[PDB]
Amino acid sequence: GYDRALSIFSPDGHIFQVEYALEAVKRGTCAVGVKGKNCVVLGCERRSTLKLQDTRITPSKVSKIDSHVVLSFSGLNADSRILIEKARVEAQSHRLTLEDPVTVEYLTRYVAGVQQRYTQSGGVRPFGVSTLIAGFDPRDDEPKLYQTEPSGIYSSWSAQTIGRNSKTVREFLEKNYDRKEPPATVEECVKLTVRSLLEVVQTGAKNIEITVVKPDSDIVALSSEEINQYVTQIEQEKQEQ
Amino acid sequence: MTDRYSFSLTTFSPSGKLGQIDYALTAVKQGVTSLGIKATNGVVIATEKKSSSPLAMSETLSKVSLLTPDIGAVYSGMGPDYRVLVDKSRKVAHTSYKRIYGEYPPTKLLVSEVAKIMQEATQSGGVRPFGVSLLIAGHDEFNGFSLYQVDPSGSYFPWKATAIGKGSVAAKTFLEKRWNDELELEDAIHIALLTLKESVEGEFNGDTIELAIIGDENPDLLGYTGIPTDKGPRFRKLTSQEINDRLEAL
Amino acid sequence: GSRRYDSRTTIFSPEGRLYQVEYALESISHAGTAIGIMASDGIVLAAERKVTSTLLEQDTSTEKLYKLNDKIAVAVAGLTADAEILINTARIHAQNYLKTYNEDIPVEILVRRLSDIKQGYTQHGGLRPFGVSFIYAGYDDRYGYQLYTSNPSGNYTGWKAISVGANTSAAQTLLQMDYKDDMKVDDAIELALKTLSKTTDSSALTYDRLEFATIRKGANDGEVYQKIFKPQEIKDILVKTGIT
Amino acid sequence: DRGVSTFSPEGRLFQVEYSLEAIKLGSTAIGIATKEGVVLGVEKRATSPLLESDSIEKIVEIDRHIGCAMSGLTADARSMIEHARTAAVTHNLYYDEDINVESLTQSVCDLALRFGEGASGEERLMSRPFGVALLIAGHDADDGYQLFHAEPSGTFYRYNAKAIGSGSEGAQAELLNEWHSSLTLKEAELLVLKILKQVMEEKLDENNAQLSCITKQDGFKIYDNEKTAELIKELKEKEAAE
Amino acid sequence: GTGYDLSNSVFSPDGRNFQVEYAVKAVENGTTSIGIKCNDGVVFAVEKLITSKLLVPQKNVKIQVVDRHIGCVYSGLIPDGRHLVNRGREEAASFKKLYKTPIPIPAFADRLGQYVQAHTLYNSVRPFGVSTIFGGVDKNGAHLYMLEPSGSYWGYKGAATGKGRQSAKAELEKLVDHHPEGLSAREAVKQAAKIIYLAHEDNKEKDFELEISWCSLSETNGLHKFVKGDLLQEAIDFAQKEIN
Amino acid sequence: FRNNYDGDTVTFSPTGRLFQVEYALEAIKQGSVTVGLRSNTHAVLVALKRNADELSSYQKKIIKCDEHMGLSLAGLAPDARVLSNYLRQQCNYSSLVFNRKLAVERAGHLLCDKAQKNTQSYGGRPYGVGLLIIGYDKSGAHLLEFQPSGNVTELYGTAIGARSQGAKTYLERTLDTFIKIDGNPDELIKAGVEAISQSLRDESLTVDNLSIAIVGKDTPFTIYDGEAVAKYI
Amino acid sequence: AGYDRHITIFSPEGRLYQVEYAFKATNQTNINSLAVRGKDCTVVISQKKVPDKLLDPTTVSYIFCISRTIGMVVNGPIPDARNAALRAKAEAAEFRYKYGYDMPCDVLAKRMANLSQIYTQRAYMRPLGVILTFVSVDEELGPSIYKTDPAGYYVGYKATATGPKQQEITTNLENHFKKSKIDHINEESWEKVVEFAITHMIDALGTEFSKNDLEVGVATKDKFFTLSAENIEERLVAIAEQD
Amino acid sequence: MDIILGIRVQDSVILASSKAVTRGISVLKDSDDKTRQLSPHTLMSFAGEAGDTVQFAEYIQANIQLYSIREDYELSPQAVSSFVRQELAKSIRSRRPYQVNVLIGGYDKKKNKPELYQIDYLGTKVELPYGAHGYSGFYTFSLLDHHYRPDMTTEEGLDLLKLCVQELEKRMPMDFKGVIVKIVDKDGIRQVDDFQAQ
């Protein structure tokens, strides 16, 4: 079998293959997640190089892992499917042996473990994927948001973004998100998600997709018109000044 | 000892070329010219027996080989590569078809199996591609007569008539001028011998030329009588004498 | 040992791209153009043969359009030999799904499987990727008519109209120009031939240089039917659009 | 290129020494051993203010009598902690007793050299050394309170006090002057906070700094963010004097 | 383009395997060892460099037995020689197990020949850094062999390898001419001692310890034995009498 | 030069040298000093231990193998763990299967053969540790020197590690004295501590610094640390 | 753009240099061989050079008895030669056990040539630097010579030659068969066929031989055997009385 | 042994399963639910070997639920029953086969029709208007052959099961502790709380 050590140390202490896996994430379309008082909202951007896609059948950037946890990503699309499939199998296995759905913290810990494993096994390159994992623990009503990266490191966030121009939108979220008082409503939480994406995306109804996860497996993907109403309302706020 | 060559030796270059497949085609270009012509009632494959010494017995070395009783093969390029491919192809016709369906594979499927073997040596760890192109002539009940070329890449194309190797370019031009979809087999053998005369530098006779056909069933070459549905092989190799007879009135 | 000769096919460039994948895509841009167009009442597949001689048999020939299922077909752009390896494992997967569930495989599931296999050669094994891109045309009772694309990276997306191979940038602009959502199959057939004709590297688009297939629902049957156009049939459909 | 497990002309393994450079880039971790218990302290070092601080788990329980601090590529520590935990529990299952800290560390260090690209000896399936050092702290009846530093080289040293990470050379210099044989547990707590504050880039508080200790009586406990905040408030007031 | 000497199984443009020849250099670097074939047996001898007074005399034995009738001596990398003898002993046990009869010497030679040769077929292994002199008595007489790092071996009347092979090979050739009808085992022991003392001239900087062993049909019953006590001293005394 | 033939153990140099084996030997000479010496009744190991800080322990140099055998290390400690553990299994096998204490000479032969394999195959690096093995079997006292090249040598006395040449010069001069120390364990240790002092150069040897081992006629292999060596200081 | 000459992969010209350099290795031992067919026998001749007076001459040989009926002469280094020999002997024993009849000469050639072809295609196996000449009196084909090289090539011969001076021996034999107009040696006893082989070897190399300079193998019906030094001596006396 | 019944009416499938778990001379449990929900509109009841029974059901459940998340879709009752059949048909020639008999009761939202499948441990699948496993069938099949009509309402179907259970409570030797009854229609799956004293 092919066992060549592809992920190795360099004189200055870097694993260059893990390093370059982040460069692929930087290339990937932007993804964002913000948690409210009683909700979490995941926002993603669509590429508009090709103006002739079929949106019914194209795999949307937000995947369900179980009925109560969702995962979005930035990076190589093909790699993300592999992580999603493994997470979905693990979710069913956890329900089988523990007789309880996964906690977001647990599912994150698993996905991060898979990514870490691919950084010190022979014959593999790391995943060129960072994930945003969001949802609600069973019986719990407290919002959970986590991020994993190609290195295998995971951590929770009040708000986070990954992908292209994520530096610009993180800069936005750092001054616009008040930890003292998180967005109290689902409405105002979606408002903040669109505002931060509009810094990167450009005037587009499509180009921005939103998914809202509420406690007890209540996950809904917003239509073009619903998102477009937020876009039409946000743009009219600037003109006042 | 460990085979640590579990990685591809054929890889995409920046220009998109698969270097090792290109170089294999270059080897086929240096090879001796071989051809194939399809007629209405048969098919003919032909080549030159380039001898490495007048002491060497060229009768012991066949460039034309029977794969199944209705399918024959010829080549240009690396002789040794061809020989082992013939062995593998003969076996796969049995293991993949005759042992499952109780009959020999149709030409297109055996060709498909041969093509699969050559593709694998394009991608598998620790191997180089085969340095041969093949011309396979055959007959089956539901497809009639056919002729395929198989390249080092694993690709295959059906031909009405073609040539590979040294003088292929000049031979393909000679065939385009002479081929029509009304040719009788005896006419196709005549063109085949005319085409080959342009490639051969040395002696031109039944001893320096190897030529076989796919035509009618040969009950005489079967080896046994008794089964009405067993009528004999369609692959017949022409003898040195039979070739010379057609060369006297050429 | 072997270290010295290892190309390391499955690694990242400093930019975050996959060397071998990028170079495989470079190879595909040299393969004959293939176009898929989805209409309201069916799908069209059209392919450009590229290398052809006068003595190349066409009646027997099948190099760019392949049948995977009774309900799903593919257009190939790239290495034909590589493609047949993938076509055969996809033909097997479809029969496994039918054996397990007694239902024909949904188009996306078959597409995902092939895209997953391609992805493997991208991340592990040290082997070169498949130098092939597919256009999938298929029907199922969930989404109806579907059109997908897949490439050496293992990525797939869904389309109304798409091109792979040579001159895709030029062909995509022409399709984006003339495509509308309320298209009928016969109008899509015309679009397919008009696009290929303007992006060919040849003098004039003839019958012997084309492969054509449609997926329609039986004009009187009421069930799905595929039709890999014969040489004579392409010759006819070419005179109708005014190309002769 | 050049083999993974390979010697430099100076007689050192490239990958191991290159891995030591990855550790120096990590967050600082400090340990102190006393006769009243062992103390572990770490720097959180969050990349962004939006990061929820108390999700940074860089102090982990191995068994009730053994704790662990990490520095460097912290993701690599997960399988080390998993092996440490399995080893400790298995010892108890096999011998109806607590695993000795010195035997637990030795077991963790056996993993460290199991990297390579070939099969001659046993079987070592791993592409590279770990990019993380560990401070292992515990207590057993035989040798009392102990502090270990476990390097990816496979060697482990017992320390009275040790600091690892970015500010380690500055931290070890300060631990040399401060440590003595009759330090109380409270002093060791304030000392850890003092050295962390010095070598950190950020102004030390209860959110970007975590404390933990291990005692014979109470075992291994991670200090909550209220208990640490009081010690920082206590340290500020003592340094303000004189 | 060069670098043909960097990998083991690589042919250089002149047809050579340069790695094998580099192993030969390690052999030439080593202590001198010899073998004499006599009228009913074989004799083996080796130089042992006394690096320090701290080496215990008669202890660091370099001559090895295979089975009960074959003796092996080598020059070069000592551990490599031991490895080869370990394989030799396994191979000999294997032979006796199947055929009952103790392995014939020509048979034993090829077993080592093939094993050493195998280490020149692959780039994943290193060739042996030893030249081995070995032999004994079988069904049809005495046999002496010498085996090169390439896997090359021949039958010998007298063999020599190592630092002082030249001086030895000249001295051996005198005996072959002067004693055509054979040499007696008792004589060959003393004579071997003279060769080692004379071949020590090349490595004459350090003091050395002589080590002799023999396998004779009439003197040892065809079994391999070391030379000890009075017979060993007699050989040292004989060598010293013809060194002045 | 050097560049090319440096790469792995499987590669010979034009002169016939194995550089990866040589670089391994270098890790020994950079390791801390250790001394071995034997008479006819006893065999003694004397080790100087090295600390990373004044706040760290002095990492142990002597490992027990059986009731009649043991060894001292210099170089990579994990590599000595692998090798001593292998030697423990070989001593154990001989006891279990044959009811026979493993001969010290034979123990050397097994370490030779294990180290050799790591010098002829791709992937495997050579061992980076030198070993001194003392023992008392059925033929009296023994001292062996192990080098990662595979070379094993039986000796009266020897030293390996940093500045070891002073100790080896001292022992070579005192050969006729210590070999006759029969039935007196303390006078062999005394000679060993005087031998290690010829390699000090830098520091004074203290109570938590020095390690000593002994095996003999009626003495099973035992290691002395702390206040147990205070009298030899 | 550097290592295509170290392993068995194609160069831009469609060549395999490792295979080409293996041919170069076959001439290393500086020895010439030839093989000829009689009426009912096949004879092989090979030069025997013993440069060292320390060697046991009886062991220096490049002719091998593969089976009872098949013999083989090798041009190339001896370690590779013995490697091939042992393989051919193994294959010959396996054929007999599996198929119930003795392996024909031409089939063993094909088998060894197929094995050679593998090392030509797989990267971890190096080619053997040897040319193998197989001889027998086959029960179907009669007297037979078949020869394989590191390329995996093999073919039958009326007569053949191998070594540094191959071409001089070949053209010499070519000239004899033009004059004789038949493709073998018209001689009933194998003794005179051995005498022919030596005579035509001498005339091509321009060097006289003694009993210790040559190596001779004969294949007859149901048997292959090598000649002793005194067998060759007897044969050398007969050619001396011819001139 | 266990009672496993099933009946398909006009617009629903009704499954009745016995509540007893008995090992030796003791009835260990009298409120056992011998069923698993595979998807919102598919239910499976099961009886057989002590361990194999629950292990197999939960294995099937995990696989169907996994499919539903991956595809974001619900498999037809026909598809689910073919999957279960093939799983059993595989295990019957393994080292230790699952000794479990099942009934699959689903509502096809596509066809707007209820479906009932009977599958035994060998992997013998068959679609039926009414089915049973074990010795139950020996009584209920002929009773239903008489009283069953293909166009009955869900309420009529419940009265028909009542007649089946009463027959089994009269003529069967074992006290099966009554039945848990579950309905599968276009609105999903629900349990009939009062059947023990309906």
Identify the structural domains of chain B with CATH numbers, from first to last: 1-250 (3.60.20.10)
Pairwise CA distance, residues D157 & D172, whole Å = 14
Examine chains B and A and say if they touch (3+ CB pairs below 8 A). yes
**CATH annotation of E1-244:** 3.60.20.10
H63: which chain A residues are within 8 Å (Cβ-Cβ)? 92
Cβ-proximal residues to A188 (8 Å cutoff; 6+ apart), any chain: A36
Task: Give, to the nearest 10 degrees, the angle between helix G190-205 and helix G166-180.
Answer: 130
Query: CB F78 to CB D155 under 8 A?
Result: yes
What does DSSP assign to residue F203? -
CA distance G211 to B213: 55
**In chain D, which residue's Cα lies nearest the Cα of A105?**
D55
Residues 6+ apart with CB under 8 A from E244: none
Strands (DSSP E) found in D141-195: 144-150, 156-159, 161-164
Look up E31 and say whether it is catalytic. Answer: yes
CA-CA distance, H190 to H192, in Å (whole number)?
7
Tell me if chain G has a CB within 8 Å of the CB of E99: no
Task: Choose among F113, F121, F155: nearest Cβ to E86.
Answer: F113
| C-beta atoms of B7 and A4 within 8 A | yes
Q: Looking at the partner chain, which of G13, G124, G174 has a beta carbon nearest the beta carbon of B5? A: G124
Check CB contact under 8 Å for E60 and F119: no
Residue G175: CB atoms within 10 A of its CB come to 12
Please check whether residue D231 is in contact with residue D211, taking contact to mean a CB–CB distance below 8 angstroms: yes
Half-sphere exposure of B57 (CA within 13 A, CB side): 15
Cβ-based neighbours of H45, under 8 Å, separated by 6 or more:
H4, H6, H15, H17, H34, H35, H102, H103, H105
Instruction: Name the one residue in this structure whose structure tokens are 């490639």.
Output: B199
Query: Across-strand partners of H107?
Result: H114
Cα Rg of chain H, angstroms: 16
DSSP state string for A184-210: -SHHHHHHHHHHHHTTTS-S-STTEEE
Per DSSP, the three-state class of D37 is strand
Does C1 sit within 8 Å of E124, measured CB to CB? yes
- Identify each DSSP E strand in chain E by its residue range: 33-37, 41-46, 64-66, 70-76, 130-138, 141-147, 153-155, 158-161, 211-216, 225-226
In sequence order, which residues have a C-beta less than 8 Å from that of residue H89 and are 6 or more positions away? H122, H123
Query: Do the beta carbons of residue B213 and residue B189 sit within 8 Å?
Result: yes
Residue written as token pair 């098949």: G70
Burial of E178 (0-12, 13-18, 19+ CB in 10 A): exposed
The residues of F whose Cβ lies within 8 A of any Cβ of E are 4-5, 9-18, 105, 109, 112-113, 115-117, 119-122, 149-151, 153-158, 168, 171-172, 175
**Structure token digits, residue F195:** 């031998």
Strand partners, G217: G44, G226
CA–chain centroid gap for G49, Å, is: 16
Q: Are F70 and F133 in contact (CB under 8 A)?
A: yes
User: B62, B73 in Cβ contact below 8 A?
Assistant: no
Counted domains in chain D = 1
Residue type, G56: D
> Quick one: which H or E segment has residue F35?
strand F34-38
Which pair of tokens denotes residue A90? 């693990």
With touching defined as 3 or more inter-chain CB pairs under 8 Å, the answer for chains C and E is yes
Q: Which residue from D minimizes the CA distance to F60?
A: D157
Q: What angle do CA F117, F118, F121 make, to 5 degrees?
A: 80
E124 touches chain B (CB under 8 A): yes
Q: CB–CB of D208/D200 below 8 Å?
A: yes
In the structure encoding, which two tokens stand for residue C112, read together? 């995902």
* Nearest residue on chain E to G53, alpha-carbon basis: E173
Rounded to a whole number, what is the distance in Å from the CA of C55 to chain A's nearest CA?
39
The CA R_g of chain F, rounded to the nearest whole Å, is 18
Residues 6+ apart with CB under 8 A from F82: D121, F127
Query: Angle E229-E234-E235 (CA atoms, 0-180°, nearest 5)?
Result: 105
Give the C-alpha separation, G26 to G20, whole Å.
10
CA D181/CA A235 separation, integer angstroms = 68
Please give the order of strands across the beta sheet that includes F62-64.
Answer: F62-64, F69-75, F129-137, F140-146, F152-154
What CATH number is attached to the domain comprising H5? 3.60.20.10
- Measured CA to CA, the distance from residue D65 to residue D88 in angstroms comes to 10
Helices (H), F120-205: 165-173, 175-178, 185-196
What's the angle, vertex CA B119, arms to CA B117 and CA B123, rounded to 5?
A: 115
Nearest Cα to G128, choosing from G176, G76, G63, G188? G76
Two structure tokens written together for D139: 């207590």
- Residue count of chain C: 244
The neighbour count for residue H114, using CB atoms within 10 Å, is: 25
C96 Cα to chain H: minimum distance (Å): 11
- Which positions in chain C touch A149 (Cβ < 8 Å)? none
Tell me which DSSP letter residue A13 carries.
Answer: S
Antiparallel, parallel or unpaired: β C72-78 and C65-67: antiparallel
CA distance D223 to G85: 77
Q: Does domain A1-241 have CATH number 3.30.110.30?
A: no
Asked if the Cβ–Cβ distance from E26 to F113 is below 8 Å, we say: no
CATH 3.60.20.10 at F1-233, yes or no:
yes
Paired tokens of G96: 């007999």
C vs G: CB pairs below 8 A: 8
Residue in C101, C109, C142 closest to H79 by CB: C101
Kindly list the residues from chain F whose CB atom is less than 8 angstroms away from the CB atom of residue D7: 20, 23-24, 26-27, 125-126, 128
Q: Which of H18, H3, H21, H42 is nearest to H183 (CA)?
A: H42
Q: CA A109, CA A111: separation in Å to the nearest integer? A: 6
Resolution (A): 2.8
Please give the Cα distance from E59 to E46 (Å, whole number): 14
CA distances to B155, E134, E161, E212, E232 from E194, rounded to whole Å, are 73, 20, 16, 11, 12
* Residue that is written with structure tokens 């300079």 in the block: G213
Contact yes or no for C4 and E124 at CB 8 A: no
Domains, chain G, ordered by start: 1-243 (3.60.20.10)
Between CA F119 and CA F226 the distance in angstroms is: 39
CA B118 to chain centre: 15
Which residue of chain C has the CA closest to E7? C1
Count interface pairs B-E at CB distance under 8 A.
Answer: 8
User: Which fold is adopted by the domain C1-244?
Assistant: Glutamine Phosphoribosylpyrophosphate, subunit 1, domain 1 (3.60.20)
Contact criterion met (CB below 8 Å) for H46 and H35: yes
Way it was determined: X-ray
Which of G198, G186, G188 lies closest to G35, judged by CA? G198
Distance (Å, rounded) from C-alpha G146 to C-alpha G133? 6
Handedness of CA F137, F142, F148, F150 (dihedral sign): negative
In degrees and rounded to multiples of 5, residue D63 shows phi and psi of -135, 180
Round to whole Å and give the CA distance between E150 and G229.
28
Which residue is listed with tokens 């409210």?
A36
Instruction: Compute how many other C-beta atoms are within 10 angstroms of the C-beta atom of residue H68.
Output: 17
H65 touches chain A (CB under 8 A): yes
Which residue in E31, E32, E120, E161 is the catalytic one? E31
